Amino acid sequence: FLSGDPNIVDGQPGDYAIEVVQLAQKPAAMSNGFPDKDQTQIGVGYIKFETPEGTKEVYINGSNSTLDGVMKQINAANVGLKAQVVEDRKDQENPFKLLVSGLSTGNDSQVTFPKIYLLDGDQDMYFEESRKAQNAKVKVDGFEIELPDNKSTDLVPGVTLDFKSAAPGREIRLSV
Amino acid sequence: FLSGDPNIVDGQPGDYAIEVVQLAQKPAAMSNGFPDKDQTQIGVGYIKFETPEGTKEVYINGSNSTLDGVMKQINAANVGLKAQVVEDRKDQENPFKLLVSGLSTGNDSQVTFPKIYLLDGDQDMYFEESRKAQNAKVKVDGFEIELPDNKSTDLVPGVTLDFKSAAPGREIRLSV
Amino acid sequence: FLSGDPNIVDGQPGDYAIEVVQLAQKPAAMSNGFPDKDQTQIGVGYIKFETPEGTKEVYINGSNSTLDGVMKQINAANVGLKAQVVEDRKDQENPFKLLVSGLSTGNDSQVTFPKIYLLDGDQDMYFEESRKAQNAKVKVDGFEIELPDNKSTDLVPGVTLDFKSAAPGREIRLSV
Amino acid sequence: FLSGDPNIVDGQPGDYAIEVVQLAQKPAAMSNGFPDKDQTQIGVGYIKFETPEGTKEVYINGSNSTLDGVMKQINAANVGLKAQVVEDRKDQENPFKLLVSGLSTGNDSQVTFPKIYLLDGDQDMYFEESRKAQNAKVKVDGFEIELPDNKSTDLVPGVTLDFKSAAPGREIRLSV
Q1: Which one of A147, A155, A171 has the shortest CB-CB distance to B166?
Q2: B–A contact: 3+ Cβ pairs < 8 A
Q3: Residues 6+ apart with CB under 8 A from C122
Q4: Whose C-alpha in B90, B132, C126, C165 is 20 to 30 A from the C-alpha of C90?
Q5: Are D8 and A87 an interchain contact pair (Cβ–Cβ within 8 Å)?
Q6: A67 conformational bin, left if phi > 0, alpha if psi -120 to 50, beta if neither
């Protein structure tokens, strides 16, 4: 198996034409900005997630409701979510943001973020932005189809393809 | 021989400027979606193809007219067509589609799909989408010309070029 | 020296930001299509070129005024021009075209094609398309400047850069 | 750690989706064109820079106020600026330009060029163009955030990422 561009599509007989239009997308949400990740407290209560495995409510203990504490409690809850704190200089005074993302891509792995219930915080936490889970969009011999993940065993029979990047308008030739 | 980008154009004395605008395209058609590829039967009769080698009619035996059976019978017919079943999550309830493609690219290798004649199926099969065969479009020193295949022995004299991907607006420099 | 993308810019201390907007372009002209390159004769006389080295008139001998003969006579004239015959399937009946290009890029290496004087041909030859010589356009720390060739010793002091492809909007980081 | 495209993002466990929308930009200014870099004198006085470290005034000695002399005096001043002379064929008669750039990227590393005070020059020097310092723009799981530099230790926890090129619309998959 050879890909015309392993940095768009790689894998492990015929002439196969594949275009990666969009990668599959994880559902995700990003907080408003905070001036620090280790002092300003967001309060006590819970954050609600609606997931393919049902409603999940992650309990935020005032003990440690800094952005860092909340990230660690979301990760320790093991509810199909991965949290991290990122720095976004769009607001230089409030650069720190909580990013929470599903672990799976595809329309069927949707996560929503419908409620943050928190009392006594130093500052309001909210998800300023969210993104829905999405399928990959790929073209096979010019036909756009949707895939749940960034891999396929069906497009090139006998090969497992992994999409490495989205490159709309950059059709790649593969051979086997 | 060196290509400025082997993942757009590679091959096996001068300064050669080549842009791959569009890869050469196989003629192809893709079915409507089915809920499965191994149970729902499309019926008995035939599927008609108009090819550069003349009219071809592939006989679909009710014995095995699942999408999988039809794919196997199209391939076994040896009429210049390659069939496979793909999964397209655009319709989650009916994800399975038959993709049928010519083996050759270029305007002169046209295939059309003018008739599906099938009685007693569980569900209607039809080609929801088709694509015409097309030439590659490449620019040599800025002039767009058309090629039948994704290779050339004429653009860089003494070298066989293979186009690995389309990259419109990305002129590549080659040397020999 | 390291380039962030050797397939856009490569070469042989600091942080250097380079974008290749357009490669430098050779002046060139391409004929109308012919049904063959080895039988149909274009006649006797000459083809005129205006070059940076002055007016050049290449004499076409009726002995061999096929597209192939003309290509060989232009090359043998040694007037700063390189000719080849390409196949362009835009007109399937008349696919063969003469491509004539200058050997140098840049605005100062302009070539024009102002006259074809040919009597007794089987078919009219003319330059259906021509292209002017052009400078490369590159951005250095965001400023677009023009270069005569697809190389530079000035952009990154102490290094000779060779532009491998044009990639407008794809700023590359280089280090030394 | 593996990047789907090391020529966009490289570095040194999870599924990480990163798009480099724009590289971080150095503040910079480029002069008008001069016919030479080693004879035409721009005069005596100073060039003013406003920098994050305060107002800096670089003294231009008539002894050597060629574009080359000025470049060398700006570099020898050690005021957070790097100067070089580039050749820009946009004006073939006046191709030589002084490019002066900050050493740091990001909104907080702004440099402006508010005054050139020079008497007795052969020709006027001025900054025909300038560019403000800017943050990198990157998307993490589809959310655009701003970074001061072309690196990050926060996007992929436990890895130092270096952005090698901007590739808007080309989301890259990374793994750890």
Answers
A1: A171
A2: yes
A3: C40, C41, C42, C43
A4: C165
A5: no
A6: alpha
Q: Residue A39 has which token pair?
A: 């002092």
> Which tokens hold the place of B119?
């009685």
DSSP-derived 3-state class of residue A4: coil
| HSE-up of residue C100 (Cα within 13 Å, Cβ side) | 33
Give residue A104's identity as a one-letter amino acid code.
Answer: S
Beta strands per DSSP E along A25-135: 28-31, 44-51, 54-60, 81-87, 96-102, 112-119, 127-131
Residue to test with chain C: of D23, D38, D162, most C Cβ within 10 A: D23
Helix (H, G, I), strand (E, B) or coil at D5: coil
* A62 residue type, one letter: G
The data reach a resolution, in angstroms, of 2.0
Return d(Cα B94, Cα B113) in angstroms, integer.
22
Query: In sequence order, which residues have a C-beta less than 8 Å from that of residue C46 and are 6 or more positions away?
Result: C57, C58, C59, C60, C117, C118
Instruction: Say how many C-beta atoms besides its own lie within 10 A of residue C140's C-beta.
Output: 23
**Burial of residue C55, with CB atoms counted within 10 A of its CB: 0-12 exposed, 13-18 middle, 19 or more buried:** exposed
Contacts of A159 (CB under 8 A, 6+ apart): A1, A11, A12, A153, A176
- Rounded CA-CA distance A44/A62 in Å is 5
CA-closest candidate to residue D43, choices D19, D69, D25, D72: D69
Domain ranges in chain A? 1-24+136-176, 25-135
